[PDB]
Amino acid sequence: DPSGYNPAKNNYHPVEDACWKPGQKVPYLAVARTFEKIEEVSARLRMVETLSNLLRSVVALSPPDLLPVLYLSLNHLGPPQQGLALGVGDGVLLKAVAQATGRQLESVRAEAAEKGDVGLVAENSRPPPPLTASGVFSKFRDIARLTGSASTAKKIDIIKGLFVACRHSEARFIARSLSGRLRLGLAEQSVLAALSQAVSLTPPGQEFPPAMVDAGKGKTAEARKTWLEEQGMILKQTFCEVPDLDRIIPVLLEHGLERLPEHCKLSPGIPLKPMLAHPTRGISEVLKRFEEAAFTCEYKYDGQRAQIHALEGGEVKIFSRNQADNTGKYPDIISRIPKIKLPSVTSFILDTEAVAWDREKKQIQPFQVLTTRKRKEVDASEIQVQVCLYAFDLIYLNGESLVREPLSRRRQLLRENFVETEGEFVFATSLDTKDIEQIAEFLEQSVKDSCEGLMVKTLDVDATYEIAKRSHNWLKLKKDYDTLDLVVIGAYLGRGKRAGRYGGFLLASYDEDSEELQAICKLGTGFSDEELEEHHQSLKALVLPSPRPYVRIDGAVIPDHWLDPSAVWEVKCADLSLSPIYPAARGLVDSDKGISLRFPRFIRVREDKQPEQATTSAQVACLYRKQ
DNA sequence: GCTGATGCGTG
DNA sequence: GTCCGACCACGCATCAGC
Ligand SMILES: *P(=O)(O)OC[C@H]1O[C@@H](n2cnc3c(N)ncnc32)[C@H](O)[C@@H]1O
């Protein structure tokens, strides 16, 4: 009986403690109950162990279900390059809940808003055979495949069929998954650790009943932890280089974990998660961490991280940092390929930054202009916003992976085999030096050239390419490394930890000329959970039925509740920015823009100030002219 | 065709 | 101080209802 399944028990037996028989399908209730126990236990090690116990039973009894169970635990539909999206959110899901329960959409919306979790609405109110893990996962991909006119009704029909067959907590987790907020607490890192733990304790490919159910039975605590850690590194190193569960899992099941590296090798065509950098507080922190290792300084470009794959045989593909295929977004980049390599180059993987380039002015354009590029089936002749590629690394070249070579070798191979064209393809502006004064000028020269600052990377000491890692061998020297008193004019309903309260707030400045409150930004960060739930009733007491006449929000997201303008909060932010959405100081710096706060954060209540004593809009413009 | 509502993606 | 999972703003893309 799956309703009593307990993958959080000590001395978990993969066969006897499972809630289904060998050879039959894993029931979705087993996955749901695992999700329940993962959320109950209060330690990450226990959450991994609980998920591992489910995978051990899946490996021992139902190997062909391992892939769906992994994808359901990750709330994904397949490999990232395939670009499958459900096309459903809270809107489509609430329509299905209202139809499945025969209730009005408004009453279902209000209940979902009050509880901040659509999964609770679908569960608390709802014969068909029990749901299976592979069955539910197949329905998820069916919903994703439906597009075009009248496709919403077809999606809701599949969703409705899921809710009628749900039992116990199944409907809460199907609803949360379909909405894109499963909130399991485990993701790629933990799910991979659970997988390696499972196949280590209960090896795959055994004849039923498995003679080996717990390979760590006799080990001491320290030896067991060390052995699991070492096995986890084998799976995570191979996955970093071939992040495709559709390729990894069949080979893992047929040849085991320790033989898995000999079958999966890095090659062009499969996107990789790029190497990332850690922020630094200044140049002195950079030299302290790098000590004496020689490093290089490159411009910190403001564009899209673009991984360019050239397969042996001419095929070129462009991937995003999240491993989505963007080849169709960049027809201009494809046509540029023969102009950027010597004829001797036949295959590679480039690490570049695609930056919007004003071809008439020969200048770099900010990231916002880049987002206005079309995404859907782009024609090169219709491209309005050209791009210049700024290449700075080389992962693969002519059949050989370079990830283990030092950056000085990879940089050299990049310069020796690829050719530069102005405003199209160039190497990142770089400086090799140790002089603190010289570095400081390069950073100022960088922001003058319309960049965010400097990236600093070691050349030979700890200078390998670390896939899917925010490394400490790369450092950011960012320009952004203001305090304002704003009025709270609206509240947004909260989800997750803020389910029974407010999740965000709409802030506004004071316009002296018109005596109006002008929306300036949304705020939801900087609060402690205590000072939010303790003072929630104070703000709820200010709810109005209608917006006050002097409150002006223009294109901002209309609040879930208008609040009586009375609360003034001290708010900090990184910088200000021109915004086409917010009306604060709309005609003071630009003719039709307006100023908003980038990354605002709550600091303190200002109960001594009234709304008309807030930071004026004129003061917002004055701060923008300086920044 | 038009439009308000609704969904996706990354830096 | 480090690691990890969740979240998001603002751009474009999609679609019901008429
Ligand atoms: P900031 O904290 O805004 O980071 C900018 C992102 O862009 C990537 N990036 C820009 N320029 C480079 C160079 N020259 N080399 C490597 N990466 C770069 C950063 O990795 C940040 O993700």
Numbering used by the authors: 262 to 387, 395 to 749, 755 to 900
Q: What does the publication say?
A:
Ribonucleotides in DNA cause several types of genome instability and can be removed by ribonucleotide excision repair (RER) that is finalized by DNA ligase 1 (LIG1). In addition to RER, LIG1 plays a crucial role in Okazaki fragment maturation during DNA replication and completes DNA repair pathways. To maintain the integrity of double-helix structure during DNA replication and repair at the final step, LIG1 ensures high fidelity during a three-step ligation reaction: the formation of DNA ligase–adenylate intermediate (LIG–AMP) in step 1, subsequent transfer of an AMP moiety to the 5′-PO4 end of the nick (DNA–AMP) in step 2, and finally, a phosphodiester bond formation coupled to AMP release in step 3 (35). LIG1 attempts to ligate the RER intermediate following RNase H2-mediated cleavage and fails on the RNA–DNA junctions resulting in the formation of abortive ligation products with a 5′-adenylated-ribonucleotide, 5′-AMP-RNA.
In our crystallization studies, we used LIG1 wild-type (LIG1WT) and EE/AA mutant (LIG1EE/AA) that harbors E346A and E592A mutations, resulting in the ablation of the high-fidelity site (referred to as MgHiFi site). This mutant has been previously utilized to crystalize LIG1 with nick DNA containing non-canonical ends owing to mismatched or oxidative damage. We solved the structures of LIG1WT and LIG1EE/AA in complex with DNA/RNA junction harboring a 5′-ribonucleotide at the nick. We captured LIG1WT and LIG1EE/AA structures at step 1 of ligation reaction when an AMP moiety is covalently bound to the active site residue K568 of the ligase. The root mean square deviation (RMSD) was 0.190 Å, demonstrating that both structures share similar global conformation. Furthermore, we observed, in both structures of LIG1/5′-rG:C, that the active site residues Arg(R)738, Lys(K)744, and Arg(R)589 form salt bridges with 5′-PO4 and the shift at R738 form a putative hydrogen bond with 5′-PO4 as observed from the superimposition of LIG1/5′-rG:C structures with our other previously reported structures of LIG1 in complex with nick DNA containing canonical, mismatch, or 3′-ribonucleotide. Amongst all LIG1 structures showing the catalytic core consisting of AdD, OBD, and DBD domains, we observed that the major difference was the rotation of 5′-PO4 downstream the nick DNA, which widened the major groove downstream the nick DNA and resulted in a narrowing of the minor groove. The minor groove is the interaction site of the OBD, and the conformational change downstream could alter the interaction between the OBD and AdD, resulting in an increase in solvent accessible area at the minor groove where the OBD and AdD interact with the nick.
